[PDB]
Structures are given as structure tokens and as C-alpha cells.
Design a protein around this ligand. Structure first.
Ligand code: CL
Length: 273
């Protein structure tokens, strides 16, 4: 029974470090949206949020301040997270993984093309609409890495250790785009194996050492077919300047492999075939 202007906040979708996220339903129009509620940087988030316009990125509808609390209205992805579609120790069917990977690259290319890096790509932040279309959500760590056609290097460490690229832990400053690419590879690994390969990509983490030594008889690699594994070998490359870029991902054999049948034709409601 809480509400904001014309919307009722009817269900808690999740929780933030500084927020809560609610299902908001418009009393008049019946539209359903998501609303992130922040008690009391968020100015920066809003500027980035207003830039977003792409089918694989959560759209921003506007905001409201009421005393101490900010409300950020956002497109709803009613299917929830990709995280909940990954069966532990299994993953998901390869054709479904490929499709989600396709969508994820489309959203990341978009963001990179407007000079925005998300910086915390992981299945928890990849939401699904009612047709299972992927949407990159939560721009609270996002930042500008290109402005007026000039790249800036990053230096703040942030993200989530099992998804983070090794340069982020090793270098004083690093390029944004390869970091996002690396985390897309860890997502792909999770979709195909239902398990993360390492706690973190550091020289003191055995499982990472094992990967650099190509011990792909170990989990999770041994669960992964040779084609997508060859892509993962190009993505999960320690040196960020040697790592595959998105233009080249789009040329990869597995990325271009036909795997998934299209949806059945929609039901006739009027007229003929
Ligand atoms: Cl996992």
C-alpha cells in the first residue's frame, strides 16, 4: 500500500546497497514498471540513465524526489534475472546460451558506442522480459569512458571478483572495453557450465593458473563443447590488448553457428494466413 504520485508500489523485486526496487503499477493506466527507491553520484547515474535507448538495455522513464527519497522509474523485465535460469553444475541448453550471448553483446556494443561502461556485468544484472529478451540493468557503477571521441582510462577498482578482468587488479589504469568483454566471457562460462571458473583472476588462484596452463580437462571447461570453448579461449586472455574485441567476437565460429529454432508462428486473431 505505499505509492508515489499515480503509482502503487506493490511488490519488492530486490534490494540495493543503498536502495530497494519495487514493482510499480499505474492506478489509471495499469502500466507496470520497476522503481528503484534510494534513501538520500545518483546525479551521475541519472545522467547516464537518460542516455539509454536500446532494446537490450533497461530504459529509464524519469525520476521523482520526495524529501529524502529518490525514485527512479525504469522499464520492467518481468522474467527476472538470467541468474535464475542457470542450473547449478549444468548451465542451460547451448542454443539458449547463444541467444542470450547474442543479446548481451548487442547491449554491450550499444553501451560502448555511447561511451558508457557498465562495469558489473554478471547474470544477476541481466534481466529477461516476458519473451526472454535480455536487458542489462543497474547503472549504479556505470561510467563514461569515452567523451567527445576521446577515451579515458579507468582507475577505480569495482565489480565482482569472479567476473572482474585481471588487469583491473594488476594495472594502475586500464581500458574499459576489454574489462566488460572479460565479464561477458565469465557470464558465457556460467551459462554453459552452471559454475564459475575461479574466485578471482589472480596469480595466487589455482583455478586461474590452471586455465592459463590450458588444463581444460578440469571443470568447468570440460562441460563446454569445443566451439564455444574456442571462443572462451579468445575472451579469457590475460593481456587486455591481446584479448578479442567485440567486432571479432562477431566473427567467431560458435557465435555464428546456427543452433536455435525460431518461435512458432503467432496465433491468428483476425484475417487469414
Ligand atoms: Cl554459477
Amino acid at each position: 500500500v505505499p505509492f508515489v504520485e499515480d503509482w502503487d508500489l506493490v511488490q519488492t523485486l530486490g534490494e540495493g546497497a543503498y536502495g530497494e526496487v519495487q514493482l510499480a503499477v499505474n492506478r489509471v493506466t495499469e502500466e507496470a514498471v520497476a522503481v528503484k527507491i534510494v534513501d538520500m553520484n545518483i546525479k551521475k547515474e541519472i545522467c547516464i540513465l537518460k542516455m539509454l535507448n536500446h532494446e537490450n538495455v533497461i530504459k529509464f522513464y524519469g525520476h521523482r524526489r520526495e524529501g529524502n527519497i529518490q525514485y527512479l522509474f525504469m522499464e520492467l523485465a518481468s522474467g527476472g534475472s538470467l541468474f535464475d535460469r542457470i542450473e547449478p553444475d549444468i548451465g542451460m541448453p547451448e542454443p539458449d546460451a547463444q541467444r542470450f550471448f547474442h543479446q548481451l553483446m548487442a547491449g554491450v556494443v550499444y553501451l560502448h558506442g555511447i561511451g558508457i561502461t557498465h562495469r558489473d556485468i554478471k547474470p544477476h544484472n541481466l534481466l529477461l522480459d516476458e519473451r526472454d529478451n535480455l536487458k542489462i540493468a543497474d547503472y549504479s557503477l556505470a561510467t563514461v569512458f569515452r567523451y567527445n571521441n576521446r577515451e579515458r582510462l579507468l582507475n577505480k577498482m569495482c565489480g565482482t571478483l569472479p567476473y572482474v578482468a585481471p588487469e583491473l587488479l594488476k594495472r594502475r589504469e586500464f581500458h574499459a572495453e576489454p574489462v566488460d568483454v572479460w565479464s561477458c566471457g565469465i557470464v558465457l562460462t556460467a551459462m554453459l557450465a552452471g559454475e564459475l571458473p575461479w574466485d578471482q583472476p589472480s596469480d595466487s588462484c589455482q583455478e586461474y593458473s590452471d586455465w592459463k596452463e590450458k588444463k581444460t580437462y578440469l571443470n568447468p571447461w570440460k562441460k563446454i563443447d569445443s566451439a564455444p570453448l574456442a571462443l572462451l579461449h579468445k575472451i579469457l586472455v590475460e593481456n587486455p590488448s591481446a584479448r578479442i574485441t567485440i567486432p571479432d567476437i562477431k566473427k567467431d565460429r560458435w557465435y555464428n553457428k546456427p543452433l536455435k529454432k525460431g518461435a512458432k508462428r503467432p496465433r491468428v486473431t483476425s484475417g487469414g494466413v
